[PDB]
Amino acid sequence: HLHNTWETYESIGQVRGLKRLDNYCKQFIIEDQQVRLDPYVTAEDIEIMD
DNA sequence: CGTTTAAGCGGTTGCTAGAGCTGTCTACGACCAATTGAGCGGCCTCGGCACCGGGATTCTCCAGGGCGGCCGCGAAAAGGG
Numbered sequence: 001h002l003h004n005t006w007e008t009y010e011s012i013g014q015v016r017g018l019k020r021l022d023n024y025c026k027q028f029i030i031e032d033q034q035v036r037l038d039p040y041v042t043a044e045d046i047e048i049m050d
Numbered sequence: 051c052g053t054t055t056a057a058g059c060g061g062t063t064g065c066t067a068g069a070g071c072t073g074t075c076t077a078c079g080a081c082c083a084a085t086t087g088a089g090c091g092g093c094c095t096c097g098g099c100a101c102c103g104g105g106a107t108t109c110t111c112c113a114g115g116g117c118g119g120c121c122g123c124g125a126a127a128a129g130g131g
Contacts, residue, residue, distance in 0.1 A: 017052095019051075019052075020051095020052070023052070023053090
């Protein structure tokens, strides 16, 4: 956990665990921007998720 | 293969169902004798189907009566010597 690297998809290539990064990206990015862009969002939900 | 989730194990807390044991008794079924009426075989008779004799009903055939055609036949009109 000290050799954690800030990487990019073109900087990785084809290694094991790439679909872990894919699942992370799709899940966090899609419902993060969904809860940021929805009109039916209360302040309580955004503060508990923050 | 990544992720979630529910199985598995251990734990609570009280009550109730159920197995096991002991005890009592009472209705219920085995058992026996006398009896008799429901089952099995035969015997008799009717309902219905069928066979036979008799009578009524409709179809086919043979003969008589009348009419057409032939068979030369025979009386009669016209021509010839």
